[PDB]
Write a protein that binds this ligand. Structure first.
Ligand code: GNP
Ligand code: GNP
Ligand code: MG
Length: 179
């Protein structure tokens, strides 16, 4: 209360430890980055309110370490989420290859009809690129996922990545005028 919003969307970040989930969260919600961030303790969330078609959408973004955890924690994490972002590190091909493992956790825990986006983070490390863009783009298309390469470090495409997901959920859950 105190805040006028039309929608609240819970969105979860999933992906290997180290890919940059927490920095994506912090960059998107509070415009902060930390080069010395460590593995996440417990579960955290932050919120940013954006505007789409003149409606205010509260985007509540959840974060937890990309590591094995108990069933009760993972169920609470996914519960109520209407969007997910699967994150890999464009400089680390093993993280990208593990995306199918994250897709599996998603299918196993997520509510019906969640919007899914794939993010290749750390695009500022293109001098050490291990994952070709066209390969990742194709993988996203094959699995009906949004796709963006981002850098939490320099802010490149971070708003774009989150906004596109939010706009996609918004599209789904509201009525729209034609012409
Ligand atoms: N809780 C609450 N907040 C309101 C209400 N009306 C306006 N506000 C706050 O006042 C802010 C400024 O109003 P408004 O200009 O309508 O915001 P917008 O965000 O719609 N800006 P433009 O529309 O861009 O100014 C709103 O963004 C909102 O945070 C209200 O009825 N209840
Ligand atoms: N160069 C660069 N480094 C990044 C970028 N994003 C995150 N990092 C760095 O990569 C490291 C890991 O980031 P972090 O956000 O903590 O990853 P995480 O996915 O949250 N890990 P965990 O799951 O364990 O909690 C940190 O040193 C962080 O600063 C980026 O866009 N570019
Ligand atoms: Mg983290």
């Amino acid at each position: 209360m105190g805040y006028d919003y039309d929608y609240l969307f819970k969105i979860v970040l999933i992906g290997d430890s180290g890919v940059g989930k927490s920095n994506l969260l912090s960059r998107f919600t509070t415009d902060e980055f930390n080069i010395e961030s460590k593995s996440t303790i417990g579960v955290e969330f932050a919120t940013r309110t954006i505007e789409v078609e003149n409606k205010k959408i509260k985007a509540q973004i959840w974060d937890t370490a990309g590591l094995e955890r108990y069933r009760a924690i993972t169920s609470a994490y996914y519960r109520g989420a209407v969007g997910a972002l699967i994150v890999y590190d464009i400089s680390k091909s093993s993280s990208y290859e593990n995306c199918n493992h994250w897709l599996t956790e998603l299918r196993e825990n997520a509510d019906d009809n969640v919007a899914v986006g794939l993010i290749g983070n750390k695009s500022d490390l293109a001098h050490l690129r291990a994952v070709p863009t066209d390969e990742a783009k194709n993988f996203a298309m094959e699995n009906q996922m949004l796709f963006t390469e981002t850098s939490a470090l320099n802010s490149d495409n971070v708003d774009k990545a989150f906004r596109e997901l939010i706009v996609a959920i918004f599209q789904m859950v509201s009525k729209h005028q034609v012409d």
